[PDB]
Design a protein around this ligand. Structure first.
Ligand SMILES: Nc1ncnc2c1ncn2[C@@H]1O[C@H](COP(=O)(O)OP(=O)(O)OP(=O)(O)O)[C@@H](O)[C@H]1O
Ligand SMILES: Nc1ncnc2c1ncn2[C@@H]1O[C@H](COP(=O)(O)OP(=O)(O)OP(=O)(O)O)[C@@H](O)[C@H]1O
Ligand SMILES: Nc1ncnc2c1ncn2[C@@H]1O[C@H](COP(=O)(O)OP(=O)(O)OP(=O)(O)O)[C@@H](O)[C@H]1O
Ligand SMILES: O=c1ccn([C@H]2O[C@@H](COP(=O)(O)OP(=O)(O)OP(=O)(O)O)[C@@H](O)[C@H]2O)c(=O)[nH]1
Ligand SMILES: O=c1ccn([C@H]2O[C@@H](COP(=O)(O)OP(=O)(O)OP(=O)(O)O)[C@@H](O)[C@H]2O)c(=O)[nH]1
Ligand SMILES: O=c1ccn([C@H]2O[C@@H](COP(=O)(O)OP(=O)(O)OP(=O)(O)O)[C@@H](O)[C@H]2O)c(=O)[nH]1
Ligand SMILES: [Mg+2]
Ligand SMILES: [Mg+2]
Ligand SMILES: [Mg+2]
Ligand SMILES: [Mg+2]
Ligand SMILES: [Mg+2]
Ligand SMILES: [Mg+2]
Lengths: 559, 559, 559
């Protein structure tokens, strides 16, 4: 087992998550089996309790774990499945040793942060990195650890102490440290004192960096490389840079151009790892596929515009799996994507009195779009604006996908306007008044990977054709509210077909509307099962439908 | 409310606990109401799970809290009652904020060590210092906080960060810092660089010391004072020393000789605290009583020897409340005390084969003693040796006190040798063989302050006369095993009278033997209710009985 | 825009102001945006010139408008902000059309009460009801107009004529009339001829009532309802009653029990007003919060007593915002309130010669109280009595709040007795003698919403913790006199800390005294920013401090 810590810097926004995911995928090009662990200094047990306004969305695993967003970067670059154990936190590990001290496994000893908590962290990392995470039976060859927060924040102290010990409690040449660090530019001169201070803060904790990975708005000067490589122990080829490029898929090839594998191939002795003839082929094949999708982003120009309608769209981190799911679906179509970020509340007619500027801009953006997405996220702000987007998309025949809350919004819209029930509404917020036209109801969560069964007549639907006309689908759920199953037959008779349901019925999971080119919704989040070469099927439907060629996509999928 | 932090140094053994207790009692000489809080960086919720081989005994509060030993130093110097809340720990406060984050009181925010855990520590200190701790109704004027561990140990980090904030979240002139620090002597020269480094480690965390309290084997030189007072912000009178004197009761008067009150009277503005005419009298009266008991230790010479028989007596911290209870009882008698530390196992005849030196020395020490104590502490090592000490004390008519296990050992001894049941024994360790002559049985703990009722005939006993012939007694329990109540009438008929029991009966709490000058035992720990001017009654009995004058002590108590 | 006139009756004391405020809040439970306008037949431009001995206190708006007291009932029930335009008067509107006729906008026409003044009233009501009054950007859906004085008083004539026209100059189903009327009981029989005469006086002016709201000391008999509903056009459900209950917060639920919303929901066609899904939730949520605070007044019993010390306390209308601010603060604590009304002059030692009865009763009341308030109000009567209450509260350690004059009285008290300047005094009344120990000085008014900045060291204070430790506070001022800033450093050195000041300094706005559980004063009136669910912070401090639990209140506010 090899370990690669990706760590620290001078700021919390530095973009470690891209570099960790990219470093792991580059190791996967050698054919190595790879896994990864995110460490969070926060005291929350999970990202589930904490609101999307901080650290972006929670990400859902097959376990039903509501983990930190960074686990999604690993799953979609590395192709692996992660467990709720792969997101370590301060909350998890203090809860673990405190529950263990009350149970008494420490034999009446005094329990202390060193050695007992730092040995508990090292036991967690040793257990969790040996969980098999590919579909194959094998234990991973390499583990990427991403150390969240910044080095020398008091929040991090047990993890920087544990990782010092770990560099010896596992062999050297089985452990290596990448430090990620800020190189700000002032008056056009590339200033280095922030990264020199961060390299000292690592040495103060006994962590010694094997590569320094600069984050900068420029190519590093050869003087900027030398002034760091002379201050730190790293050689000139071990001062990595990652530029402020928009395409995060280019980062693996920007690291490969900087010869970063050729250092780790020595520094971790990756030639001593045994590999089969299948492994080297499936490794090199994966690199050629990534050269092709990045070539397609360099030379595809013909924009498809998708409008994304939701709360707090200024927090673009709040929708990162949607963004990445749309980008995978646009690459599969060989088309460039624009996302138009529509703050759903500004669509509402009260905005035309309160701030007439925001009203006209938000309705410009929505009218402009070749297809529409309603992305999910609980909370009562802007839902009539999201209902207005679903209405516009139904009436103007514009491709629509509704994910989680977006499906319920389309059901409420179709009830208010096509069934003509003018006060039909979500149970989430009006039930203090005990309303009879319930569109949502409660059914304390439904979470993680679940089976959807396609209902027997559904063979006609574009969405069931996108799932290869298979009878069942596996996707990740997260909801407490679902469509009222008393009203379902009214919608299924008026043409809004609930194409798929849970095994028990009375719990709707996919709809497609008869008489529209692509108007679809899902109760699950299709984003989380997206992979770079195999996009999320409902999103491959939406981004093909917006472009045209949805028939040719379905004809392809029938091979 | 005023706060006085006592803190840190270069080593964990430095003796903060004496200085905190002494500083608080000196503030009590002004008539101020005083309280105190111990902070422990360990992850244990309580000292109850952890074995006496580390940090000495657990101390029992009236709550039944098995707290850190340092709470006992506060109760016996300050005269206060502490709650299980007055011992803060890493385990307590991480358990508190983690349970609070799962309950969700933090409104979906990300929870972090700063500000959320440091604000939870500051809320704990603010709540707990306002608990009334004297017998009177009033809230305390001053709180002493003792910061356990050492400054810049990673274990301490949330508490040194919290206390920086606290210096502002409560006013300056309502908070002050005492730093306690090591001044080692090499070649007879008093070296200062360890304390200069500890003063820098405080400044690095933003904590600024108002007094530096040196711990040294000498009087500080005036150069040793100046070389510290020139390096640090403290004036010459704010460099305190506490010498390696044996009598810890002299420390309050050694601080008073160094004019330490006259600094805090300015630095905490203690003249602005309102005080009544009763308060100043009961304050100054308390100082004169302490001048008298310390004068008596300077001029009493006529030694009483008590042998203390138990496990691990090399760990003299394991019996600190016994030691202090014996010292209070010897001072009340105006007699000097020697304790003879007898490792109970060495009394056993197997020792005479294994190491004949340890056998003869341990039996020398036991034969030498004017009275005998068997102190408690669970675990099967040496119990036949403790039975042999109880036998010797019964047969030779030598004063005996058995506390907790020491009472059960005397019951087992009296059963084996006076009732003549040769295999009668503790249920604690032989019950894998299901023995019928059970002396102990289980009755998951009995803990904290409980009532003992004296059984109706008991008026004759020296122990009930020592409790003023009152019908009931309040003392602190800690046990899972008690005397088999089926066998009690056999002992009460053979003369081993169970003088006191729980309200329900079938649970024995005090015995006295008919036909011995003072042979007594208690199921409770009488040590924990000892106070400097009012010693523990069973121990005032033992140390009077060893000296003679037990009648005159009882005649006094009848006033 | 909908209008609801609340009007008239047989007497000026009838309690329209409660019914208007309650009717508006009930409309706010539907989620409608609401506003209100008070009409006063008096010739004063504002309530600022007129003394508190008539129509109670003046109320201060954010504008600095010294408006009629009834505007405060609207702000505290409806949650809205009012402008100096929302109090219409005879003085305002005759000043408006006379200044407009001298300017000549009437093009040389003869100007007459009809149509020109009645059209000016209708233009005022149309302009002012469309001012946005919530924190949100929206124009109000409903306006409550309260017609002051009584119908057919000659003082009212232009307003009853204007409102007849207004019923057509705005649509019917956009205007409705509530008439409030007296139903006296004689020999236990509920006499109706006063209200029959008041209903005729409305018809004589062409105003037709849509509901009759009886004010009576009983439940109306069903015969009393029928004998009114047969004489007037109103149906049986449109004869409202409001009982002489003490809790004015119960009136909204007594109107809701009488189904009064279900009439206005038809009669104003409030189902035709568009509402969003947020609006209906924030509407129904507000009703549940009001059910809870009224449930708490039904089942809280554990009295806190506050003594209110001031001039003319027999005029309990003179302190209505203080009373309501104390009631909001007691409800937030879940405790019942008694106010003890202490006429401040009777505390003075001259009273013990003049009327020894009034002396002993006033000092009984002040000694009895768990906390003390000095409420403001200019004029030289009783100020030494208010100084004696401030003295008593400082010395006996009893919670104290001084508002406006009450802060200056506490500064004068602390100067006379703790600084020991025996003749230090207000500049307001002794300056004919040109005294050097000035405690007040003049600094022609300071009025309306202003910023207070907390001075840098103030983090310790209970008052700054009650304001959430925010650096700035927004509250309503009204004063010509302030603390002499030459003497401020003497008080700040002796412990009376001026915790907050104006942006410029030299103008003190909050004090808290070091060394008292809660002794505070404000130059602003904290009463006017009180709201039913969010009490005034200095008053939430006082009423918590009197009860105990001031720490737990501050711990709560830190969430
Ligand atoms: N080299 C990079 N190139 C482009 N974008 C980057 C780069 N580094 C960081 N970012 C961007 O900055 C944001 C944060 O990056 P990332 O998640 O990898 O940082 P992080 O250190 O893991 O932050 P966090 O601790 O919050 O998870 C993301 O939007 C990411 O795409
Ligand atoms: N000034 C002193 N004079 C005499 N003995 C001292 C002094 N300082 C410390 N000691 C002794 O050293 C031991 C530890 O002292 P103390 O309990 O006060 O230290 P501490 O800092 O509180 O240690 P801990 O953190 O383990 O509780 C005790 O036996 C105590 O009596
Ligand atoms: N229904 C009621 N229940 C309880 N108290 C009432 C009621 N109606 C009036 N009052 C009380 O009578 C006094 C005057 O009431 P209110 O201010 O509402 O009358 P008003 O018609 O507006 O008088 P004004 O014209 O002087 O403003 C207040 O103390 C008020 O609390
Ligand atoms: O204003 C002054 C005065 C003096 N100095 C002095 O400090 C020295 C250290 O040089 P710098 O502080 O400029 O550091 P650096 O260029 O090595 O590092 P970067 O942060 O640019 O990566 C010398 O340059 C000396 O003149 C300054 O740097 N700045
Ligand atoms: O062996 C050597 C050589 C050089 N130095 C040098 O270091 C200097 C600092 O002096 P010290 O290191 O002796 O420190 P100090 O006496 O101030 O502190 P204490 O630890 O005794 O309290 C000077 O004395 C200089 O000669 C040594 O201290 N020791
Ligand atoms: O003393 C007399 C004599 C005659 N009347 C006469 O006047 C009549 C009108 O009856 P009332 O004047 O009693 O009026 P009312 O009962 O309808 O109204 P309230 O004021 O009680 O609501 C009849 O009752 C007739 O006898 C009196 O009312 N009172
Ligand atoms: Mg941040
Ligand atoms: Mg990240
Ligand atoms: Mg140790
Ligand atoms: Mg200690
Ligand atoms: Mg009047
Ligand atoms: Mg009124």
């Amino acid at each position: 087992m090899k370990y690669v810590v990706v760590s620290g810097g001078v700021i919390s926004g530095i973009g470690k998550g891209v570099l960790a995911s990219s470093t792991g995928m580059l190791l996967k090009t050698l054919g190595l089996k790879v896994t990864s662990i995110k460490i969070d200094p926060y005291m929350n047990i999970d990202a589930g309790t904490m609101s999307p306004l901080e650290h972006g969305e929670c990400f859902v695993l097959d376990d039903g774990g509501e983990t930190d967003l960074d686990l999604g970067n690993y799953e979609r670059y590395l192709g692996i499945t992660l467990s709720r154990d792969h997101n370590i936190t301060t909350g998890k590990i203090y809860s673990h040793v405190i529950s263990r001290e009350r149970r008494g496994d420490y034999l009446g000893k005094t329990v202390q942060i060193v050695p007992h908590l730092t040995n508990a962290i090292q036991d967690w990392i040793q257990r969790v990195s040996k969980i098999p995470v590919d579909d194959t039976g094998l234990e991973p060859d390499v583990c990427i650890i991403e150390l969240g927060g910044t080095v020398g924040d008091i929040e991090s102290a047990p993890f920087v102490e544990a990782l010092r010990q770990f560099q010896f409690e596992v062999g050297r040449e089985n452990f290596a440290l990448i430090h990620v660090s800020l190189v700000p530019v002032i008056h056009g001169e590339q200033k280095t004192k922030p990264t020199q201070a961060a390299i000292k803060d690592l040495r103060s904790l006994g962590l010694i960096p094997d590569m320094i990975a600069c984050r900068c708005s420029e190519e590093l000067n050869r003087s900027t490389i030398d002034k760091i490589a002379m201050f730190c122990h790293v050689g000139p080829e071990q001062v990595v840079n990652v530029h402020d490029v928009n395409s995060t898929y280019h980062v693996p090839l920007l690291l490969l151009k900087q010869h970063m594998i050729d250092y780790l191939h020595s520094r971790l002795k990756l030639g001593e790892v045994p590999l089969t003839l299948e492994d080297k082929e499936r490794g090199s094949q994966l690199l050629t596929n990534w050269e092709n999708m990045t070539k397609n982003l360099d030379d595809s120009d013909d924009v498809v515009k998708i409008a994304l309608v939701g709360k707090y769209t200024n927090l673009k981190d709040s929708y990162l799996s949607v963004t990445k799911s749309l980008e995978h679906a646009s690459m599969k179509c060989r088309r460039q994507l624009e996302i138009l970020w529509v703050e759903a509340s500004n669509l509402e007619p009260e905005t035309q009195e309160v701030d007439k500027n925001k009203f006209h801009d938000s309705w410009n953006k929505l009218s402009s779009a070749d297809g529409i997405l309603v992305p999910g996220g609980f909370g009562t702000r802007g839902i009539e604006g999201m209902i207005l987007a679903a209405k516009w998309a139904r009436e103007s025949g514009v491709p629509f996908l509704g994910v989680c809350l977006g499906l319920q919004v389309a059901a409420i819209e179709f009830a208010r306007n096509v069934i003509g029930r003018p006060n039909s509404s979500s149970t989430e917020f009006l039930d203090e008044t005990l309303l009879a036209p319930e569109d949502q109801v409660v059914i304390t969560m439904r979470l993680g990977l679940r089976p959807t069964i396609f209902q027997p007549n559904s063979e006609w639907s574009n969405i069931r054709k996108l799932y290869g006309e298979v009878n069942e689908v596996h996707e990740r759920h997260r909801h407490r509210y679902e469509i009222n199953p008393k009203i379902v037959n009214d919608m299924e008779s008026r043409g809004f077909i609930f194409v798929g349901k849970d095994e028990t019925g009375q719990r709707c999971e996919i709809f497609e509307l008869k008489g529209h080119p692509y108007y679809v919704g899902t109760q699950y989040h299709p984003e989380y099962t997206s992979k770079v070469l195999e996009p999320s099927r409902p999103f491959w439907g939406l981004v093909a439908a917006a472009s045209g060629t949805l028939g040719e996509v379905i004809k392809d999928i029938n091979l």
